[PDB]
Amino acid sequence: FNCYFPLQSYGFQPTNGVGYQPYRVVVLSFELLHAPATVCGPKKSTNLV
Amino acid sequence: KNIDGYFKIYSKHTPINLVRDLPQGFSALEPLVDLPIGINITRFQTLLA
């Protein structure tokens, strides 16, 4: 009464629908601080004339 | 040396013949590696074996 265990398990069964199936989700966050860069994307390259 | 967050290290290895605890002459120190850390430093300490 007026008390509840807050954590509960997921019902990820093979028969679940699109709205209940499991989905491996990843959230990619970026950060621009005063410190310098550390990871920059791949740059294009070409032959040497 | 601390270059606005980029800590640089120069080095040189040469033989000597110690006579007065500090061999004199001339040499040139080559660079070793750049370190994009970005952390303020004001003191240091040696690690002896």
SS (H, E, C) B15-27: CCCCCCCCCCCCC
Q: Where are the beta strands (DSSP E) in A1-49?
A: none
Chain B residues whose CB is inside 8 A of the A38 CB are: 36
CB < 8 Å to B36, chain A: 36, 38
Contact present, B27 and B14 (Cβ < 8 Å):
yes
CA B38, CA A17: separation in Å to the nearest integer? 49
Distance (Å, whole) CA A9 – CA A48: 59
Closest chain A residue to B3, measured at CA: A36
Establish how many alpha carbons lie within 13 A of residue B30's alpha carbon, considering only the half-sphere containing its beta carbon. 4
Q: Which residues of A1-31 are buried (b: 16+ CB within 10 A; e: fewer)?
A: eeeeeeeeeeeeeeeeeeeeeeeeeeeeeee
Cα distances (angstroms) measured from residue B36 to each of A15, A32, B1: 51, 15, 12
Q: Which residues contact B28 (CB under 8 A, 6 or more apart)?
A: B12
What's the order of all strands across the beta sheet hosting B30-36? B2-3, B6-11, B30-36
Q: Resolution of the experimental model in angstroms, please?
A: 3.4
